[PDB]
């Protein structure tokens, strides 16, 4: 009855996969806020590609204080919070390069950050890059499909669905 494979052909819930790496449930993130969901729903990606595109750009809501994080909005319904690795904030983004100079209103994907993961990793306790969605049209559960490896710009990886 619980038909898990609700993948769909057009399984792109305004989500052109942001990074290539390994997906992990939000709970796995070594931080209370993320681990306990606190601000919303979401998941972690342990990244590989030092190139980060956007699930949706839509409209950049807020910039990074220390290049490691950003706030986005699709249209008016899904507001997103991103964090890139852990303690990268502390690292002052030493190895980061920001592509969006947060000119808010933009179309999806197109690189948010380029980030020297290779050099960042040894300088951080964890590479967990959590993505949280707050408002989530007050009912969108973040139905993870790709409970394993993930690749950039892919579809049917996570489904924001009721």
PDB file of C-alpha atoms in Angstrom:
ATOM      1  CA  UNK A   1       0.000   0.000   0.000  1.00  0.00           C
ATOM      2  CA  UNK A   2       2.846   2.354   0.985  1.00  0.00           C
ATOM      3  CA  UNK A   3       4.053   2.647  -2.643  1.00  0.00           C
ATOM      4  CA  UNK A   4       7.540   4.061  -1.889  1.00  0.00           C
ATOM      5  CA  UNK A   5       8.516   4.373  -5.647  1.00  0.00           C
ATOM      6  CA  UNK A   6       6.393   7.577  -6.146  1.00  0.00           C
ATOM      7  CA  UNK A   7       9.229   8.859  -8.375  1.00  0.00           C
ATOM      8  CA  UNK A   8       7.233  10.340 -11.307  1.00  0.00           C
ATOM      9  CA  UNK A   9       8.681  11.207 -14.738  1.00  0.00           C
ATOM     10  CA  UNK A  10       8.741  14.988 -14.147  1.00  0.00           C
ATOM     11  CA  UNK A  11      10.006  14.348 -10.572  1.00  0.00           C
ATOM     12  CA  UNK A  12      11.614  17.826 -10.420  1.00  0.00           C
ATOM     13  CA  UNK A  13       9.901  19.612  -7.513  1.00  0.00           C
ATOM     14  CA  UNK A  14      11.834  22.781  -8.502  1.00  0.00           C
ATOM     15  CA  UNK A  15      14.954  20.848  -7.452  1.00  0.00           C
ATOM     16  CA  UNK A  16      17.839  20.690  -9.948  1.00  0.00           C
ATOM     17  CA  UNK A  17      20.191  18.777  -7.550  1.00  0.00           C
ATOM     18  CA  UNK A  18      22.766  21.265  -6.072  1.00  0.00           C
ATOM     19  CA  UNK A  19      25.874  19.040  -5.567  1.00  0.00           C
ATOM     20  CA  UNK A  20      27.478  15.681  -6.385  1.00  0.00           C
ATOM     21  CA  UNK A  21      28.357  13.432  -3.419  1.00  0.00           C
ATOM     22  CA  UNK A  22      26.446  11.321  -0.848  1.00  0.00           C
ATOM     23  CA  UNK A  23      23.030  12.212   0.675  1.00  0.00           C
ATOM     24  CA  UNK A  24      22.474  11.607   4.417  1.00  0.00           C
ATOM     25  CA  UNK A  25      19.382  12.331   6.593  1.00  0.00           C
ATOM     26  CA  UNK A  26      19.437  15.722   8.351  1.00  0.00           C
ATOM     27  CA  UNK A  27      19.735  13.899  11.715  1.00  0.00           C
ATOM     28  CA  UNK A  28      23.272  12.743  10.719  1.00  0.00           C
ATOM     29  CA  UNK A  29      24.578  16.355  10.733  1.00  0.00           C
ATOM     30  CA  UNK A  30      27.043  17.063  13.637  1.00  0.00           C
ATOM     31  CA  UNK A  31      25.077  20.149  14.820  1.00  0.00           C
ATOM     32  CA  UNK A  32      21.986  20.417  17.071  1.00  0.00           C
ATOM     33  CA  UNK A  33      20.019  22.873  14.869  1.00  0.00           C
ATOM     34  CA  UNK A  34      20.362  20.739  11.723  1.00  0.00           C
ATOM     35  CA  UNK A  35      20.245  17.357  13.521  1.00  0.00           C
ATOM     36  CA  UNK A  36      17.000  18.205  15.355  1.00  0.00           C
ATOM     37  CA  UNK A  37      15.450  19.774  12.178  1.00  0.00           C
ATOM     38  CA  UNK A  38      14.763  22.946  14.298  1.00  0.00           C
ATOM     39  CA  UNK A  39      14.058  25.547  11.562  1.00  0.00           C
ATOM     40  CA  UNK A  40      12.340  23.210   9.040  1.00  0.00           C
ATOM     41  CA  UNK A  41      12.902  19.988   7.053  1.00  0.00           C
ATOM     42  CA  UNK A  42      15.830  19.038   4.866  1.00  0.00           C
ATOM     43  CA  UNK A  43      18.835  16.770   4.398  1.00  0.00           C
ATOM     44  CA  UNK A  44      22.619  16.652   4.284  1.00  0.00           C
ATOM     45  CA  UNK A  45      24.909  16.087   1.386  1.00  0.00           C
ATOM     46  CA  UNK A  46      28.500  15.073   2.059  1.00  0.00           C
ATOM     47  CA  UNK A  47      29.889  16.711  -1.114  1.00  0.00           C
ATOM     48  CA  UNK A  48      32.569  15.668  -3.636  1.00  0.00           C
ATOM     49  CA  UNK A  49      32.374  18.267  -6.438  1.00  0.00           C
ATOM     50  CA  UNK A  50      33.835  21.625  -5.356  1.00  0.00           C
ATOM     51  CA  UNK A  51      31.121  23.191  -7.596  1.00  0.00           C
ATOM     52  CA  UNK A  52      27.728  23.886  -5.995  1.00  0.00           C
ATOM     53  CA  UNK A  53      24.692  24.664  -8.202  1.00  0.00           C
ATOM     54  CA  UNK A  54      21.269  25.569  -6.699  1.00  0.00           C
ATOM     55  CA  UNK A  55      18.144  23.367  -6.177  1.00  0.00           C
ATOM     56  CA  UNK A  56      16.319  26.569  -7.155  1.00  0.00           C
ATOM     57  CA  UNK A  57      17.879  30.028  -7.269  1.00  0.00           C
ATOM     58  CA  UNK A  58      14.580  31.798  -7.858  1.00  0.00           C
ATOM     59  CA  UNK A  59      15.414  34.701  -5.612  1.00  0.00           C
ATOM     60  CA  UNK A  60      18.440  34.862  -3.313  1.00  0.00           C
ATOM     61  CA  UNK A  61      16.912  35.787   0.069  1.00  0.00           C
ATOM     62  CA  UNK A  62      20.195  36.466   1.937  1.00  0.00           C
ATOM     63  CA  UNK A  63      23.994  36.282   1.538  1.00  0.00           C
ATOM     64  CA  UNK A  64      26.718  34.357   3.281  1.00  0.00           C
ATOM     65  CA  UNK A  65      28.354  36.043   6.314  1.00  0.00           C
ATOM     66  CA  UNK A  66      31.588  34.027   5.699  1.00  0.00           C
ATOM     67  CA  UNK A  67      30.772  32.541   2.213  1.00  0.00           C
ATOM     68  CA  UNK A  68      29.743  29.158   3.813  1.00  0.00           C
ATOM     69  CA  UNK A  69      25.934  29.667   3.786  1.00  0.00           C
ATOM     70  CA  UNK A  70      23.128  31.344   1.833  1.00  0.00           C
ATOM     71  CA  UNK A  71      19.355  31.909   2.058  1.00  0.00           C
ATOM     72  CA  UNK A  72      17.165  31.314  -1.058  1.00  0.00           C
ATOM     73  CA  UNK A  73      13.485  31.377  -2.091  1.00  0.00           C
ATOM     74  CA  UNK A  74      11.868  29.695  -5.083  1.00  0.00           C
ATOM     75  CA  UNK A  75       8.882  31.980  -5.828  1.00  0.00           C
ATOM     76  CA  UNK A  76       6.803  32.285  -2.640  1.00  0.00           C
ATOM     77  CA  UNK A  77       6.413  28.969  -0.808  1.00  0.00           C
ATOM     78  CA  UNK A  78       9.842  27.310  -0.436  1.00  0.00           C
ATOM     79  CA  UNK A  79      12.506  29.345   1.412  1.00  0.00           C
ATOM     80  CA  UNK A  80      15.849  27.548   1.746  1.00  0.00           C
ATOM     81  CA  UNK A  81      18.808  27.792   4.154  1.00  0.00           C
ATOM     82  CA  UNK A  82      22.138  26.245   3.146  1.00  0.00           C
ATOM     83  CA  UNK A  83      25.337  25.525   5.101  1.00  0.00           C
ATOM     84  CA  UNK A  84      28.503  24.316   3.360  1.00  0.00           C
ATOM     85  CA  UNK A  85      30.506  21.906   5.521  1.00  0.00           C
ATOM     86  CA  UNK A  86      30.867  22.364   9.311  1.00  0.00           C
ATOM     87  CA  UNK A  87      33.257  24.896  10.994  1.00  0.00           C
ATOM     88  CA  UNK A  88      33.804  26.484   7.519  1.00  0.00           C
ATOM     89  CA  UNK A  89      32.249  29.548   9.042  1.00  0.00           C
ATOM     90  CA  UNK A  90      35.156  29.372  11.551  1.00  0.00           C
ATOM     91  CA  UNK A  91      37.489  28.719   8.602  1.00  0.00           C
ATOM     92  CA  UNK A  92      36.191  32.096   7.200  1.00  0.00           C
ATOM     93  CA  UNK A  93      35.543  30.273   3.907  1.00  0.00           C
ATOM     94  CA  UNK A  94      39.338  29.906   3.374  1.00  0.00           C
ATOM     95  CA  UNK A  95      39.132  28.119   0.011  1.00  0.00           C
ATOM     96  CA  UNK A  96      35.679  29.417  -1.091  1.00  0.00           C
ATOM     97  CA  UNK A  97      34.728  31.492  -4.157  1.00  0.00           C
ATOM     98  CA  UNK A  98      31.171  32.850  -4.466  1.00  0.00           C
ATOM     99  CA  UNK A  99      29.451  32.871  -7.855  1.00  0.00           C
ATOM    100  CA  UNK A 100      26.150  34.487  -6.885  1.00  0.00           C
ATOM    101  CA  UNK A 101      26.852  38.087  -5.846  1.00  0.00           C
ATOM    102  CA  UNK A 102      23.343  37.658  -4.570  1.00  0.00           C
ATOM    103  CA  UNK A 103      21.519  39.505  -7.294  1.00  0.00           C
ATOM    104  CA  UNK A 104      18.336  38.025  -5.778  1.00  0.00           C
ATOM    105  CA  UNK A 105      15.938  37.243  -8.595  1.00  0.00           C
ATOM    106  CA  UNK A 106      17.583  34.502 -10.772  1.00  0.00           C
ATOM    107  CA  UNK A 107      16.664  31.279 -12.615  1.00  0.00           C
ATOM    108  CA  UNK A 108      17.675  27.808 -11.148  1.00  0.00           C
ATOM    109  CA  UNK A 109      20.935  25.850 -10.880  1.00  0.00           C
ATOM    110  CA  UNK A 110      23.705  28.140 -12.163  1.00  0.00           C
ATOM    111  CA  UNK A 111      26.560  27.847  -9.601  1.00  0.00           C
ATOM    112  CA  UNK A 112      26.111  29.471  -6.167  1.00  0.00           C
ATOM    113  CA  UNK A 113      29.680  28.707  -4.957  1.00  0.00           C
ATOM    114  CA  UNK A 114      32.960  27.103  -6.157  1.00  0.00           C
ATOM    115  CA  UNK A 115      34.718  25.648  -3.175  1.00  0.00           C
ATOM    116  CA  UNK A 116      38.106  23.911  -2.709  1.00  0.00           C
ATOM    117  CA  UNK A 117      36.632  20.874  -0.899  1.00  0.00           C
ATOM    118  CA  UNK A 118      40.022  19.122  -1.271  1.00  0.00           C
ATOM    119  CA  UNK A 119      41.762  21.707   0.958  1.00  0.00           C
ATOM    120  CA  UNK A 120      38.697  22.557   3.076  1.00  0.00           C
ATOM    121  CA  UNK A 121      38.095  18.925   4.234  1.00  0.00           C
ATOM    122  CA  UNK A 122      41.349  18.430   6.281  1.00  0.00           C
ATOM    123  CA  UNK A 123      40.600  21.827   7.942  1.00  0.00           C
ATOM    124  CA  UNK A 124      37.046  20.878   9.129  1.00  0.00           C
ATOM    125  CA  UNK A 125      35.576  18.276  11.549  1.00  0.00           C
ATOM    126  CA  UNK A 126      32.887  17.454   8.933  1.00  0.00           C
ATOM    127  CA  UNK A 127      32.003  18.221   5.304  1.00  0.00           C
ATOM    128  CA  UNK A 128      28.248  17.785   5.986  1.00  0.00           C
ATOM    129  CA  UNK A 129      26.529  20.389   3.803  1.00  0.00           C
ATOM    130  CA  UNK A 130      22.938  20.587   5.131  1.00  0.00           C
ATOM    131  CA  UNK A 131      20.078  22.154   3.195  1.00  0.00           C
ATOM    132  CA  UNK A 132      16.905  23.092   5.095  1.00  0.00           C
ATOM    133  CA  UNK A 133      13.627  24.365   3.706  1.00  0.00           C
ATOM    134  CA  UNK A 134      11.667  26.423   6.268  1.00  0.00           C
ATOM    135  CA  UNK A 135       8.149  27.478   5.153  1.00  0.00           C
ATOM    136  CA  UNK A 136       7.844  24.401   2.828  1.00  0.00           C
ATOM    137  CA  UNK A 137       4.365  25.705   1.773  1.00  0.00           C
ATOM    138  CA  UNK A 138       3.379  24.698   5.335  1.00  0.00           C
ATOM    139  CA  UNK A 139       3.149  20.973   4.623  1.00  0.00           C
ATOM    140  CA  UNK A 140       5.783  19.866   2.083  1.00  0.00           C
ATOM    141  CA  UNK A 141       7.592  16.845   3.507  1.00  0.00           C
ATOM    142  CA  UNK A 142      11.065  16.555   1.957  1.00  0.00           C
ATOM    143  CA  UNK A 143      10.672  13.023   0.528  1.00  0.00           C
ATOM    144  CA  UNK A 144      14.273  11.899  -0.140  1.00  0.00           C
ATOM    145  CA  UNK A 145      14.460   9.399  -3.025  1.00  0.00           C
ATOM    146  CA  UNK A 146      18.206   9.222  -3.690  1.00  0.00           C
ATOM    147  CA  UNK A 147      19.027   7.749  -0.266  1.00  0.00           C
ATOM    148  CA  UNK A 148      22.622   7.221  -1.449  1.00  0.00           C
ATOM    149  CA  UNK A 149      24.904   8.970  -3.947  1.00  0.00           C
ATOM    150  CA  UNK A 150      23.723  12.212  -5.618  1.00  0.00           C
ATOM    151  CA  UNK A 151      24.901  14.125  -8.727  1.00  0.00           C
ATOM    152  CA  UNK A 152      24.520  17.785  -9.780  1.00  0.00           C
ATOM    153  CA  UNK A 153      21.498  18.983 -11.827  1.00  0.00           C
ATOM    154  CA  UNK A 154      19.720  15.602 -11.483  1.00  0.00           C
ATOM    155  CA  UNK A 155      15.971  15.146 -10.988  1.00  0.00           C
ATOM    156  CA  UNK A 156      13.946  12.724  -8.744  1.00  0.00           C
ATOM    157  CA  UNK A 157      16.550  12.987  -5.956  1.00  0.00           C
ATOM    158  CA  UNK A 158      14.249  14.575  -3.329  1.00  0.00           C
ATOM    159  CA  UNK A 159      10.539  15.397  -3.706  1.00  0.00           C
ATOM    160  CA  UNK A 160       8.931  18.279  -1.803  1.00  0.00           C
ATOM    161  CA  UNK A 161       5.474  16.686  -1.513  1.00  0.00           C
ATOM    162  CA  UNK A 162       2.531  16.557   0.926  1.00  0.00           C
TER     163      UNK A 162
END
